[PDB]
Amino acid sequence: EFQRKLYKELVKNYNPLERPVANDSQPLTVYFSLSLLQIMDVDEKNQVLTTNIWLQMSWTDHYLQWNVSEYPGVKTVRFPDGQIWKPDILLYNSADERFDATFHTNVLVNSSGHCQYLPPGIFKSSCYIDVRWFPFDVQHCKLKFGSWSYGGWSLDLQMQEADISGYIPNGEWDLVGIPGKRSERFYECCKEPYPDVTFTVTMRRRTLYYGLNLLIPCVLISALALLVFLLPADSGEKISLGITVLLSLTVFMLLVAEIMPATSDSVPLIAQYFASTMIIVGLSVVVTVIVLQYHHHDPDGGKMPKWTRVILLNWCAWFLILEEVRYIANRFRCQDESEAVCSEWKFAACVVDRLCLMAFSVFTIICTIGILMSAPNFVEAVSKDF
Amino acid sequence: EFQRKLYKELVKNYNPLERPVANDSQPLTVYFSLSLLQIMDVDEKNQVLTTNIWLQMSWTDHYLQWNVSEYPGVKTVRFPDGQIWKPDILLYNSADERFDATFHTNVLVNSSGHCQYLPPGIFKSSCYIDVRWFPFDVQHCKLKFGSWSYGGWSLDLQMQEADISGYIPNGEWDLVGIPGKRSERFYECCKEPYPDVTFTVTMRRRTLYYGLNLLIPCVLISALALLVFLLPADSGEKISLGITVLLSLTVFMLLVAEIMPATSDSVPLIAQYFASTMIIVGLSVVVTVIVLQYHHHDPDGGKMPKWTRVILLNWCAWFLILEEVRYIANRFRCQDESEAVCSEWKFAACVVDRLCLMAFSVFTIICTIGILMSAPNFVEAVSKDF
Amino acid sequence: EFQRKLYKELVKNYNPLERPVANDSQPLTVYFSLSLLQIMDVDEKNQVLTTNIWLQMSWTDHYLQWNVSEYPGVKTVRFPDGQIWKPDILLYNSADERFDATFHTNVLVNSSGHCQYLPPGIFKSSCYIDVRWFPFDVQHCKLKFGSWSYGGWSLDLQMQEADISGYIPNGEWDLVGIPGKRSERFYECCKEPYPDVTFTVTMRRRTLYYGLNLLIPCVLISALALLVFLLPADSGEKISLGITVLLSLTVFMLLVAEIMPATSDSVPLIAQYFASTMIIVGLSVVVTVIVLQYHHHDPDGGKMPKWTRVILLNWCAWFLILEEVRYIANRFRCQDESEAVCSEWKFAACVVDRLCLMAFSVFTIICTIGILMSAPNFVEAVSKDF
Amino acid sequence: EFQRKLYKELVKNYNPLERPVANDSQPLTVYFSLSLLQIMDVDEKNQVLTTNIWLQMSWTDHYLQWNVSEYPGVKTVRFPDGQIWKPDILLYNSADERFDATFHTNVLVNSSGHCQYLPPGIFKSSCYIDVRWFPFDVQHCKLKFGSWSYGGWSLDLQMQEADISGYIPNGEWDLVGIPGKRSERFYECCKEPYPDVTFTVTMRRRTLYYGLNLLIPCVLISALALLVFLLPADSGEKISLGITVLLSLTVFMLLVAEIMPATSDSVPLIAQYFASTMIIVGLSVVVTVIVLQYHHHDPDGGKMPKWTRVILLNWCAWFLILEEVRYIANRFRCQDESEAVCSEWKFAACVVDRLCLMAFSVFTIICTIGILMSAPNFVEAVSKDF
Amino acid sequence: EFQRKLYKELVKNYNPLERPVANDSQPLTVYFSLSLLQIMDVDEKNQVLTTNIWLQMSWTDHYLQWNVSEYPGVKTVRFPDGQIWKPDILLYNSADERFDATFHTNVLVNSSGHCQYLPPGIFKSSCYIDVRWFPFDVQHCKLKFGSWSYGGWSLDLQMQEADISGYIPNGEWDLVGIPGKRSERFYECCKEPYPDVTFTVTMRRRTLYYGLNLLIPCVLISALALLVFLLPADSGEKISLGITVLLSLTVFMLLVAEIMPATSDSVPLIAQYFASTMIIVGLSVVVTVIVLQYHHHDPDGGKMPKWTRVILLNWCAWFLILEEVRYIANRFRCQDESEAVCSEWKFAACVVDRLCLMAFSVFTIICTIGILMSAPNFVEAVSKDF
Numbered sequence A, B, C, D, E: 001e002f003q004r005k006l007y008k009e010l011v012k013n014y015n016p017l018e019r020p021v022a023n024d025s026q027p028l029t030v031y032f033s034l035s036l037l038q039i040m041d042v043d044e045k046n047q048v049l050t051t052n053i054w055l056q057m058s059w060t061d062h063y064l065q066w067n068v069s070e071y072p073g074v075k076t077v078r079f080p081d082g083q084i085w086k087p088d089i090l091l092y093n094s095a096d097e098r099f100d101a102t103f104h105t106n107v108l109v110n111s112s113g114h115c116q117y118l119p120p121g122i123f124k125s126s127c128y129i130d131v132r133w134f135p136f137d138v139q140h141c142k143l144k145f146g147s148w149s150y151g152g153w154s155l156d157l158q159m160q161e162a163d164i165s166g167y168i169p170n171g172e173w174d175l176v177g178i179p180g181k182r183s184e185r186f187y188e189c190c191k192e193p194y195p196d197v198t199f200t201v202t203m204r205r206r207t208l209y210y211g212l213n214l215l216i217p218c219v220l221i222s223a224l225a226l227l228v229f230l231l232p233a234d235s236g237e238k239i240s241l242g243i244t245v246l247l248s249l250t251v252f253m254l255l256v257a258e259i260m261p262a263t264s265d266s267v268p269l270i271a272q273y274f275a276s277t278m279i280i281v282g283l284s285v286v287v288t289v290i291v292l293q294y295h296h297h298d299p300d301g302g303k304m305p306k307w308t309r310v311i312l313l314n315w316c317a318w319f320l321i322l323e324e325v326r327y328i329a330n331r332f333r334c335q336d337e338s339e340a341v342c343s344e345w346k347f348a349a350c351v352v353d354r355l356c357l358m359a360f361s362v363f364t365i366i367c368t369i370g371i372l373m374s375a376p377n378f379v380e381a382v383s384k385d386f
Ligand SMILES: *[C@@H]1O[C@H](CO)[C@@H](O)[C@H](O)[C@H]1NC(C)=O
Pocket: A067, A068, A069, A070
């Protein structure tokens, strides 16, 4: 009864286009806040963050004011999208391909005129993904909200801290925080400042999954590569193992690239270490192969080039019936002679391959300690996850 | 005729914004229920549940009341979305990217004013997927329904048990149940309690498909690994078989990861067993390779390091014309001597590889019995499916 | 002219919510039919059928009746979605994620009041896919159409046979038929029966493509496996060929799984045969490997275990200067002795591998004849396609 | 000014449902044409053609007629979707899953009443893809446009030739033509003929990309297979090369299948040649393997079966101290005897493998000349592209 | 207050269809500009550019003019989509499949009547991708904006330079510029010129990512191929390494093809070099195989064909008790003779393989220098990125 009379009374001359202020010269104060419920996805490939959030717009409507005594039993009313004025607040850095993911809901109003609007949304935002310290990386993905057509002189957009009380842990990501910042900016379009509220979702990646799925294979690859660098040139399977380890490493680099963006602002350290040890082992497999097929015939066949020889040699010095039996026995002695000789090529391949092992060791230690001493602390993270 | 007169009469002063209650101070009772028709998909990768469901809202409209005698032959009327009042009930934990998948249908009303609303929907919900006990896992995926803008003081949302009479078995999933729970909650947004109805789809996975597609290959891999651990170091194909089994196991781990989420709250036991036996076999292939190329030349070459030797040895003890023929015959005797010797390295690789087999056996038994004695009972499940 | 006057006359007091019947107590007869134009897709993975169809609703509107003499030259009128009454007929088992794929078109009306409505649609329906007899399988995919809010007492939904005159052959599927069935059902929701019309698209798969793409490789794999089972244990490449055939077979099983659902109600016979011959060949490769590395040293080394020996043996029985030359000549005779011996292990591996070949042959014949004598007759199908 | 007065005047009694003709008994002439801008995609997998096109509807509105002198300065007016009458012309064979991709734009009208309507669209159409002559194939993909509810007695849909002046070459496809055909048809639905306009996009594929990406590998595979067929049975790597070439060929067949539909109306010649040479090389690898492990022991071991022997033989005929040295010398002579023998199996494998090479050559020549003499001429196409 | 009175006053007789000009004979000047915020994606496969942009339409409405003194405190008003006139400006070369990605926002108006409209959008445009100079390529992707139904006589569409002040670097692409061009064009549809504004996004690709992910493997492949060409025919692993390098190269070519379009207007130089060195190494592996199995038996077996022999030879010339011991010793001498011979086939394979290495070197140098001296300068680009 009184609800019907009130709804009829309020919409007599109401104009949804009108900014609801008694003084048209004064701006309208809008308290905009956010409630994060769940981080639904982080597409590092497309640099997209898919979140579930409830916005919170609170403002005052000078015309929607009634007296509870006049209308007993009704302390609230609801007004849908087009029946009253709502701020045109939206997400600037949206990637939704509709550019507005809000599900328009009812606006709740009470006698004093305080209007609440909590539109939910599956918001897809564009946030820059940093993979320099992968996979022990923290991402600061931004959500920039603001009014499109209402400026500071017409809409004083204030900020209230974001709400994470209802947040549901994702499992693959850990929500460090979601701080907000209200900033006043000017654009090369318009003479009025347009305030914005930027909420910076700061979240840290969880590494147990990638610790047992990815890093264990990686340590296996490293150990196999060290094993390859330990086998001598004459080893039968040192060339085969090098080749096989190469192909596995390459496949696994492609795996890393599948889930990582093509942005050139930085390179995943894991992939950089991959490529490094990759060139190192490939160079070692190639050197062993050139030593085994070109230097084999001559004890000083690979030493003919002036440069190759002097390099290796000086650098190593610095760094360290009767006649019948006659014929057959002579030929057998020649066989024995031809079967049991090694020359400076075995020693050279051992030196070169030892140098390759040393180069590989310089890279493993440096990368391991560097990833340990990363801005997203690795020691503390593993202490937490292990 | 009378239908036209009735439709004209009912919408005289009706306001769809008005909550239809004679006493505006009293809340409106809404009986919300659900009818599950088919589980359409379970994207474990994105942790999404795609279901087909018919909602069931039943309430009372004080203004839509007629007398059948006055309007003979019309016991019902239908009102579409915007012509009368419907509750703003929706799915909180939605992932639809429209955030409302309901197809708005007609509201059915009878003379007493009892209004029915059964909007169908392809609902995409966010539910946490537990893969700890994969693939013998049960999932409790939640569907949280509630009114967005109407609170307990305005909408007493009651719950009626869900309906599965029309449910169609998926084939890959078995519907254990769909119990409901009505809860009253407060939010850091608003001073009124907002009741919700949470239906917990509890469903168990079917394993015949994964029993013959996945587990049979797994047992094959395990048997091949045991075979690898049984072959001696001198075996020609023990190093090749280890490598090949490694690559197959890795591929198959990647297969598991393709269909499993990256959540770090737990690890699939199948994948954990993969990684375990993987490191075990790789360590065994590596040990055989170091024994075959570094220890080969010297009978006590690998025994030079103090630590390696003492470990193996003490632990094993605790755990257990004439002159022409002269020359040629002497050299042939030397050949015979050089061709028929084995040393402590064969025994050490047998001990080490035997220890690797023992470690692999400790893991196989433990994991097999553990998966047998899982909270989602495995013995009963196989009894059902086999 | 007269068209304008007629359009003005008809919408004087028309109410689209009103069911257009002179007697409100009587139901309205709606003849619902279907016209299938093209089967666009069959996603066996998600069990979805994507079709192009034109619905056909024919009914009678008591209020849209004019006299052609009064309005010469106008025998028809068109009314869009919201201007007049249309039945709320829709597809129950829809998977569209809008749950209504109809493109709302104009309703055609003639002087007698007979209204036609032929909304086209790309309908996505959920139909259970049976892969038991893959790839010689027929699918009965259902399309259940019905009114959502109008029951039998208000809407007598009759069925007219479906129209395939304009159907376009898909090429991968053959349309055996599309019979219809009108059924009256009750639901745990409502006191009125709600009739439905179910059209059962019965279509058979075409196998020429899969006959030359898939089955030819399969027969190749089978022949290679038989070849593996024919080679003796001492064969150099019998262990390598077994391993390679294994990996190829596994890859090809994964190919089958890529296009097949994970439903556990049945298993593709092709995949079952895969897994069978897979375990058989793997067991044979494993047996040859255990015979070649453990039994090699001793002529009765594998015969030490009591059980292994008795099994093989009894089952086979049921189933079937001078002194210098002295030294060197003696050692050469010892070499000759050591170089030219085979023992009961060659015979045992031949017996065991022969038994593996017999097991493989029992499965090939049984599966080939079974697939020949399938409910979707294979002999007639190949006669048609070959 | 005059524009406002004109817009007010025209919509006085206008009814968008009314067909705008002075004589309601006469049909309305609609000139429908098309402007193709870009072929955006050809999904051969789903048999879908994605095009960018501007429709062109031109007709006459008897009621939208003004006098320029009465309204100076306004020679045109614009009317959006629902303000005036537009024909319900749409694409019958659409695959858009909205079934109408037109972006509704303004209708342009001039004093004589001539109305223009040029709605743009990303049209997805279903067109049958012929891969028989792949990749030198031409596709005739149809676009069938027509009015849904207006028939010949009410809408005389004329055709004007399509416009390609603004067309942008795709690069992967060459637009041979886009001829149109206006046809009058009847349906098993309705008593009135419903004319249609069918534009047949006839386009030819470009093969430089597939000439250097695909065909070069193919010729490599063919040469490797010929090499395999040239190596003798005793060749060490003839069995390995055959196996490796097999696996590569299979992978590359799967590549062809990835981009080709599963339609069984025809088979890609490239894939047919693949499968042919595949069975040929596999049969040759298998024959060499049976000759190398079963016939090896006995010079007439493979000649025991009556059938195998007679076949090969007749068909080939039609087609073409002292005693110490005694012992040791005798055994060495036996070694020499056992080391240097070949028998009828080498000759038989050469004959059989030569026959396999001949079968492979019969197929290569036949397929190469056939693809040369294809309905989509290959010689002229390569002359153009090379 | 005054805002309400103003909003009521302005919409008294306003017609959104009316072009807002005092003189209907004169055209309306519309200043159209653009603000690029972020390049979201470049799908080279489908030749699509996904951008985030804010349009900027500025024009004048003769009817929306008020006096600030009459309405104090209100200097601006906002009008949504359908309440006033907006130009029908859209993107001609759109690929959105809705063909309009603009999110319709409010139109801002001030007392003088100057109307601003800044609709944001995720615009998907079709732009031709040039991969000739991959990956050091620059793309000129066009955005053609224009009015659909308003021509030059009615809409003088002027251009203002695009705004990149708020642009966010993508990371994978570098924004060289976004120049604009206003052009007047006629169409085979209409008698009036329809001006357009074309903004040409000129952007350069970043190569650090592809420099360490892609090019490093490529140089590895090249070095391995050179190594293959250095090994002699008798090398044991020269045939295996060639085969393995072949398969890796092919896989990596497929990787290039995965991210590259099938357009035949040009070929990626990287892929062309792939195919070249691929045929070269395959020809070398094939030649070594024919030399090793057909020429082996006879020292002049491959020299029998007249052509093969003369080619190689002339081109190379231009380019450069007692009797017992008797028997056994004689047979041993025959063994020695048979074991230590090479013939003109080793020299011929060295010559041929040397020629293959020379052909490979002619291609490596030519392609490396050509890519260095590309229109998108490579030396400067690497100087920037390295
Ligand atoms: C509210 O309305 C009641 C009843 O009309 C009246 O007595 C009271 O004065 C009003 N209060 C205010 C603050 O206007």
